[PDB]
Structure formats: C-alpha cells, structure tokens
Amino acid sequence: VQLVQSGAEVKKPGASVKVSCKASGYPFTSYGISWVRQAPGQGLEWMGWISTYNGNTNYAQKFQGRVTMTTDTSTTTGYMELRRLRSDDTAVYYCARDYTRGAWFGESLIGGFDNWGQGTLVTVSS
Amino acid sequence: QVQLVQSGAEVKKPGSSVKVSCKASGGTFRSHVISWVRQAPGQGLEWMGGFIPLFGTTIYAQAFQGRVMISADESTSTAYMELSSLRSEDTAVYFCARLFPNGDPNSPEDGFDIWGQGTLVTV
Amino acid sequence: IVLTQSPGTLSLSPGERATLSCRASQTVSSTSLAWYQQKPGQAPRLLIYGASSRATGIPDRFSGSGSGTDFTLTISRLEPEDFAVYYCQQHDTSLTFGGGTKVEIK
Amino acid sequence: NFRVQPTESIVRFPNVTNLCPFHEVFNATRFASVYAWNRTRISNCVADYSVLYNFAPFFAFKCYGVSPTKLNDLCFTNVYADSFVIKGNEVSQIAPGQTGNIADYNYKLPDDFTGCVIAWNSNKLDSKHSGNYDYWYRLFRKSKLKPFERDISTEIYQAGNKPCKGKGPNCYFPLQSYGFRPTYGVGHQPYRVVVL
Amino acid sequence: DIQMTQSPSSLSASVGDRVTITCQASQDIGNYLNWYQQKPGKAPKLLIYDASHLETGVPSRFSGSGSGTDFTFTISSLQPEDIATYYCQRYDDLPSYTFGQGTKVEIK
Incomplete structure (x- = not known):
C-alpha cells in the first residue's frame, strides 16, 4: 500500500544488491510480492515474485542466479537481490503484490500484479 | 417502443412514505419485473428496490434493508416504491427502469434498460 | 480485453507524487500496452509507449508503472503540463483506448 | 480462614501467528470472474477478526449467518473467503435464501452461514464513465445453480429451437461482460464483494 | 477570443425529442470546437472535439455534428439520466478555454 522501497541505489560492476521493499500496512503473510x-x-522486465507466505519464487531466466529474491519477513521489507550489477545493469525495478500467481501455491490466480513498490532506482553508474 | 411512464416530481417529509408510480405504457410490463x-x-x-410481481415475493433495496416496502402492482398500470419511514435521505431523482431482469422478447433494442423519467424527492 | 482508468477525477495538486490506475483486464505485457496524452479536447500525443516508459517529449515529473490488470500510473510531482488528458492504450487485442483518469486541481 | 486476590494476567499461547487472507479480500484490486467465486481456504491463522469492525461504511455488513459479532472470538477452520465482482442487481441476490437473477443463474448462497458476506459498491473502482464492459457474468447460464458451489463451470444455456447445441440461434452466452455504468443505479454500479 | 457562446442556449427537451444544440460562437471556429456537457455533482466531461468525433465515453446519445459557424451537438436519443448542462468550451489552438452557458437537455 506504501511498499516502501530504496532509492538511487549505488551498486557497482561486480556487486550484489539488497533492494528494500517495506511490506506495507497489509497482512504481509497472506500474499506474494512480484x-x-x-x-x-x-x-x-519481468523480475520475479516472492511468496510473502513461504517464499516460492518465479525468478527471471535473465537473472537466474543474478536475481535471488529474499525478504525480511520480520520487519516485512522485501529484498529482491540481484548480483551482476553494472552501468548497463543500472536500471530501476519495482515491487508488486503478485495476485496473478496467487501466493501460497505458486499458482495462477485471479487479479493482476497487485499494489506496487515505491521504486528502486538502482544507480550503478560507472 | 416502450416508455415506462413514471409519476412526477414532488418532495416528501420525514417519518411518512414517499409515493411514486412507474405507470404502464401500453402493455409490456408483465415480464419486466418493475424494480x-x-x-x-x-x-x-442507488437502486430503490422494486417489487417482483413476476410470480413470487419481492426483493428489497440493499441500501435501506427493512423498511423498503417496495410494492408494485403491474396489472393496475402503476408501480410503487412505497418507502415507509422516510426521513430526508432521499433528496433524489428515483427512476423507474427496466432493470436488468426486464427485457421483453420484443423491444430488444431497449435491451435490459427501459428507463423512466425520474422523481425529485427532498425534505 | 479492456482497460480501466480508475481515478477519473484524480485530484492531487502539483508537486505531489500521485497514483493513476488505468487498470487493464489481462496480464498483458506492456510491449503492446501504452499511454497516449491528449490536450483536454485535442488529439492524443504519444505519451507512454511501453505503458510505463518515458520518451523524448515526456518530462521527469510524469510518472507511472504497472502490469497485469492493475496498471497504476504512479505520477510524480505534478504540473499543468501533466494536466492534459492521458489515455492508456492497449496495442494488444484490438485496441481499446482509455477514457478517464485526468489529474485535476483545487 | 483467609485469602483472595485479583489481578488478571492472561499471557497467551501465541506470539506472532500469521493473521489470515483477511485484509487481502477486503482490500484486493482485482477479484475473480463472478462464477469462478474466488473461494480460498483462508490460511492457518490469527484471524482475529476485529480488522473487520474497523472498516468504513460497508453498506453490506449484515452478517449473512451468525451475528456480525463473535467471528473474531469463535474458532472455525476456514471461512473460505470468496472473491468476485458484481453489479448491484446481482448483489441483491447475494444472500441466504434471497434467490434472484444472479443467485438464479450464477452465484447462489445456502440456507444460512455464508460467513459474513460484506458487499460494497465499487463505482470508482470497476467502471469508468465509458460504461465499462469488463467483467463477464452469466445470465441465461442454464438455471439457478445449487446453493454455494464454485462455478468455473459456466455451462452454456439451453435456449431451444434447435437440437445441436441447445443454444437457440448460436452461442447463448453465459458470458455477460457486466456491462454497467457509473451513471446507472447502484443496482448497476460496479460492485466488488467479499464472501465468507 | 471568439469568446465562446452557444446559440441555441437553453434548448429544453425530454427523452428523444429530436435535438438541435449548436455552439455558434461569436465568429467561426472551423475545426476548433469543443462541445461540453457537465455531469452534476462531479467534474466536467468533454464529449466531442472539433465539430464531431465523440470521446471514448459519454455515449453516442450526445452526438456531435455541424460544420460552419454553428456546430450542432444534437442528441439522437437521450434518456432520463442525460440531464447534462450543455455549455461548450472552445479549444483554441493556443489555450483560451472559453466555456459556455448551459443548454441542459431535460426530462419532465
């Protein structure tokens, strides 16, 4: 609902990212964040999705080992983690509550990519 | 084709009932459940609630739910909203329509809405 | 497949990040879906091809995102520049335009 | 003899048990096709309902079932929260008994205990003044479906004058894009509705 | 400006009521004519742009026509809800936004 994200993230060509996504005033456990x-x-670019319930993840083949979506279920802050950063990799991402694949099952459900992340404007400028 | 002539436009005051009539314009009312x-x-x-004179009991308006006594007497060439216990909330233009379950096998061009005229109620 | 500009009367004053849902129906990839700005009574501009994407003519102030059936044009700090009429398109599936969500004023 | 003492300490078994799919149907963006009632099996719990009572006017809070209280307190396995869109004339039919046009073709509810079905109009949310034609429903599906099923089965209509597929001319849609307008009655306003 | 006025200004007509609503300005508009209608208790709605070609929305009932000095926003067939005040802005190719007076099409 706010899904508080990071900002002008300064990563490097050969660093790994921990993007923030504060799972906002919704019952975090009963959903999944795409x-x-x-x-x-x-x-x-289709990034992937964390099941905020169990952490079932449909990553992107583009970022197979690169994107490794994790989350701080305790402080409800989503961490979609991408290694392989660089200037050509310095591109912004967003969060989205995945109601297309309704969570808990990794299975397609009614609804779209639901309420969205603030924005992680990853500045990996070189 | 069909017009669903409605009563008029007058104000009604609290506690009492507001009478309006969706009147029969040349047949074409029987199926035509006058909601x-x-x-x-x-x-x-809003949806005032209507009556179901099509061979059964009546549906009541969700919004008001209990004193929407919506009767409608189709053979008499009159409909009614029959809202006993009015206060002020009305202030509206209550229409009579051929609400979705009200098409004929005739007049499919006036499909599932043959609207009325409207009634300005207020205090 | 249909599109739905939800905040038909989104009233956020200039200088404040807003959110404008044009809210599709399918899970359409924005590879087709796009946005087209029209002056309030003129022909649509090429607003957002890619439906989140900023081209030449669009300033930074214009913001937006979205996928699936809940496209939320999360507009950034506003301007009268951003007070035209914006019509989120769908290049997919027999293009149904948008009809709604302008950004309004006091 | 001698003793009494009061001071209530009721430290409880749980600590942070997961809430529920609640505040996920009450607050979802895109509900299901109406006949595909998005029943789930609401999850493990702390479905301590009070987040129920807080909400702004529902316009349908009338607990279709047991009293609109006690749901937070009572402990049932799952209340199978269903999720679908309607428009008001169909919403009128969403109630125990109360069989009518959509609970006469599409969306029926049993004798009682439909959880605490919470309807509300979604004017700004499911239709634009273009008169949105988005969400498909089934009038003339075949007949009224039996109390409280899931109807991804959208069996087509027996319309006669023809043996081949029953459908009268051809393709008698139980696929009715809800086809409403923000300028209708709320009987025909967009309606997103949560069921239990 | 051409300082937009409409001339018929108060055409009274119920359902159907073969309609003529025309935003004849002071002088000629060419293909620079908005035809407005306001939805009460809400924000305005611009149905038609120059002389014709209705927006996606506010259905065909309110139908734009007329190409000359007077551009005719006739209704083919209204219904009780088409009570809407027919003022008319004029999109001037550099913004001037001169709206109208209100030619409300009524019902009883």
Whole structure:
C-alpha cells in the first residue's frame, strides 16, 4: 500500500544488491510480492515474485542466479537481490503484490500484479 | 417502443412514505419485473428496490434493508416504491427502469434498460 | 480485453507524487500496452509507449508503472503540463483506448 | 480462614501467528470472474477478526449467518473467503435464501452461514464513465445453480429451437461482460464483494 | 477570443425529442470546437472535439455534428439520466478555454 522501497541505489560492476521493499500496512503473510524491472525505455522486465507466505519464487531466466529474491519477513521489507550489477545493469525495478500467481501455491490466480513498490532506482553508474 | 411512464416530481417529509408510480405504457410490463432506481442526489447512484410481481415475493433495496416496502402492482398500470419511514435521505431523482431482469422478447433494442423519467424527492 | 482508468477525477495538486490506475483486464505485457496524452479536447500525443516508459517529449515529473490488470500510473510531482488528458492504450487485442483518469486541481 | 486476590494476567499461547487472507479480500484490486467465486481456504491463522469492525461504511455488513459479532472470538477452520465482482442487481441476490437473477443463474448462497458476506459498491473502482464492459457474468447460464458451489463451470444455456447445441440461434452466452455504468443505479454500479 | 457562446442556449427537451444544440460562437471556429456537457455533482466531461468525433465515453446519445459557424451537438436519443448542462468550451489552438452557458437537455 506504501511498499516502501530504496532509492538511487549505488551498486557497482561486480556487486550484489539488497533492494528494500517495506511490506506495507497489509497482512504481509497472506500474499506474494512480484517484481518487474523497468529498464529505462524498456517498459518493465519481468523480475520475479516472492511468496510473502513461504517464499516460492518465479525468478527471471535473465537473472537466474543474478536475481535471488529474499525478504525480511520480520520487519516485512522485501529484498529482491540481484548480483551482476553494472552501468548497463543500472536500471530501476519495482515491487508488486503478485495476485496473478496467487501466493501460497505458486499458482495462477485471479487479479493482476497487485499494489506496487515505491521504486528502486538502482544507480550503478560507472 | 416502450416508455415506462413514471409519476412526477414532488418532495416528501420525514417519518411518512414517499409515493411514486412507474405507470404502464401500453402493455409490456408483465415480464419486466418493475424494480426501482433511486439515484442519490448528486453524491452517488442507488437502486430503490422494486417489487417482483413476476410470480413470487419481492426483493428489497440493499441500501435501506427493512423498511423498503417496495410494492408494485403491474396489472393496475402503476408501480410503487412505497418507502415507509422516510426521513430526508432521499433528496433524489428515483427512476423507474427496466432493470436488468426486464427485457421483453420484443423491444430488444431497449435491451435490459427501459428507463423512466425520474422523481425529485427532498425534505 | 479492456482497460480501466480508475481515478477519473484524480485530484492531487502539483508537486505531489500521485497514483493513476488505468487498470487493464489481462496480464498483458506492456510491449503492446501504452499511454497516449491528449490536450483536454485535442488529439492524443504519444505519451507512454511501453505503458510505463518515458520518451523524448515526456518530462521527469510524469510518472507511472504497472502490469497485469492493475496498471497504476504512479505520477510524480505534478504540473499543468501533466494536466492534459492521458489515455492508456492497449496495442494488444484490438485496441481499446482509455477514457478517464485526468489529474485535476483545487 | 483467609485469602483472595485479583489481578488478571492472561499471557497467551501465541506470539506472532500469521493473521489470515483477511485484509487481502477486503482490500484486493482485482477479484475473480463472478462464477469462478474466488473461494480460498483462508490460511492457518490469527484471524482475529476485529480488522473487520474497523472498516468504513460497508453498506453490506449484515452478517449473512451468525451475528456480525463473535467471528473474531469463535474458532472455525476456514471461512473460505470468496472473491468476485458484481453489479448491484446481482448483489441483491447475494444472500441466504434471497434467490434472484444472479443467485438464479450464477452465484447462489445456502440456507444460512455464508460467513459474513460484506458487499460494497465499487463505482470508482470497476467502471469508468465509458460504461465499462469488463467483467463477464452469466445470465441465461442454464438455471439457478445449487446453493454455494464454485462455478468455473459456466455451462452454456439451453435456449431451444434447435437440437445441436441447445443454444437457440448460436452461442447463448453465459458470458455477460457486466456491462454497467457509473451513471446507472447502484443496482448497476460496479460492485466488488467479499464472501465468507 | 471568439469568446465562446452557444446559440441555441437553453434548448429544453425530454427523452428523444429530436435535438438541435449548436455552439455558434461569436465568429467561426472551423475545426476548433469543443462541445461540453457537465455531469452534476462531479467534474466536467468533454464529449466531442472539433465539430464531431465523440470521446471514448459519454455515449453516442450526445452526438456531435455541424460544420460552419454553428456546430450542432444534437442528441439522437437521450434518456432520463442525460440531464447534462450543455455549455461548450472552445479549444483554441493556443489555450483560451472559453466555456459556455448551459443548454441542459431535460426530462419532465
């Protein structure tokens, strides 16, 4: 509902990211947070999705080992973790509560990518 | 084709009932379960509740739910909203419509809405 | 497949991040879906091809995102520049335009 | 003899048990196709309902079932929260007994105990003044479906004048894009509704 | 400006009521004519742009027409809800936004 995200994240060509996503005033456990990568101009690249219940994750083959979506279930702050950062990899992503694949099952359910992350404007500028 | 002539436009005052009539315009009422539109003044829409004279008991308006005594007497060429215990909340343009379950096998162009005229109630 | 500009009367004053749902129906990839701004009574501009994406003509102040059926144009600090009429398109599936969500004023 | 003493300490078994899919249906963006009633099996729990009572006017809080209280307190396995969209004339039919047009073709409810079905109009939320034609429902599906099923089965209508597929001319849609407008009655306003 | 007025200004008509609503300005508008209608208790709605070609929304009932000095926003067939005050802004190719007076199409 606010899904508080990080900002102009300063990573490097050969660093790993811990993007923030404060799972906002919703019952965190009963949902799943998807993500898309808004590569500048490239609409949004399908990032993946964390099941806020169990952590079932449909990553992106693009970022197979790169994107490794994790979360601080305690302080409810989503951490969609991508290694392989670089200037060409410096592109903003967002959170999204995945109601397409309704959580708890990793299975397609009614609804869209639900309420969204603030925005992680990853500045890996070189 | 069909017009669903409605009564008029007058104000009604608290405690009492507001009478309006969706009147029969040349047959084409029997299936045509005369439900009832409310159209809250300018804040929002509403459905006054209507009666189900199609061979059974009546549905009541969700919004008011208990003193919406919506009777409608189709053979008499009159409909009614029959809202006993009115206060002020009305202030609206209650329409008579051919609400979704009200098409004929004729007049499919006036499909599932043959609206009325409207009735300005207020205090 | 249909599109739904939810905040038909989104009233956020300039200088404040807002959110404008144009809210599709399918899980359409924005590879087709887009946005088209029209002056309030003129022909649509190429607003957001890619439906989140900023091209040449669009300033930074215009913001937005979205996927699936809940496209939320999370507009950033506003301007009268951003007070035209924006119509989120769907290049997918027989293009149904948008009809609604302007950003309004006091 | 001698003793009494009061001071109530009622430190409780749980600590931080997961709430429920509650505040996820009460607060979802996109509900299901109406006949595919998005019943789930609401999850393990702390479904301590009070987040129920807080909400702004529901316009349908009338607990279709046991009293609108005691749900937080009582402990049932799951209340199978269903999720679907309607428009008011269909919403009128969403109640125990109360069989009518949509609980006469599409969405029926049993004798009682439909959890605490909480309807509300979604004017700003499911239809734009373009008169949205989005969410498909089934009038003339075949007949009224039996109390409280899940109807991803959207069996087509027996419309006669033809043996081949029953459908009268051809394709008698139990696929009715809800086809409403923000300028109708709320009987025909967008309606997103939570069921239990 | 052409300082937009409409001339018929108060065409009274119920359901159907073969309609003529025309935003004849002071002088000629060409293809620079908005035709407005306001939905009460809400924000305005611009149905038609120059002389014709209704927006997606506010259905065909309110139908734009007329190309000359007077551009005719006739209704083919209204219904009780089409009570809407027919003022008319004029999109001037550099913004001037001169709206109208209100040619409300009524019901009893």
